[PDB]
Every structure is written in C-alpha cells, then in structure tokens.
Amino acid sequence: MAKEFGIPAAVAGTVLNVVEAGGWVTTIVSILTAVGSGGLSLLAAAGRESIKAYLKKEIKKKGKRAVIAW
C-alpha cells in the first residue's frame, strides 16, 4: 500500500484492522483520504466490489505484513 498507491504505513495498518475484525471500511476510508491521493487510488482498485469485501478477502489471502509494503 505504501509503495503502489502512495500511502504511509499509518493508514495501511488501519486497513488491516478492517480485515482482522470484519469492521467498517467507512472509518478507514477517512484515514486513507486524509493522506490525499493514496486513499483515492486504493478506493479505485475495487470500488464496485466494495473496498470492504475487497481488502477482507485480499489480505486474508495475502498476509498483512506484505500489505504494509504494498
């Protein structure tokens, strides 16, 4: 997330919370967009299929540590 989208680990970690707990992406989205472009670029990735279900399945398969880098 840090590399690909232009995020700090700050907001990518908040995304991990979503995955781990089955939590509201709505709160996470604010923290992401507070960065600027990094938030928006993530939101574009699977907007339609909900960013919620996206990250939930994607990181469940991926592994959280790599998502910090990604």
Automatic annotation (TrEMBL):
The keyword Kinase does not apply. It comes from the Bacteria. It is found in: Secreted. GO terms for biological process: defense response to bacterium; killing of cells of another organism. The chain crosses the membrane at residues 25-47. One of its GO terms (cellular component) is extracellular region. Keywords: Antibiotic, Antimicrobial, Bacteriocin, Membrane, Plasmid, Secreted, Transmembrane, Transmembrane helix. This is AS-48 protein. It comes from Enterococcus faecalis. The chain holds residues 36 to 105 of 105 of the full protein.
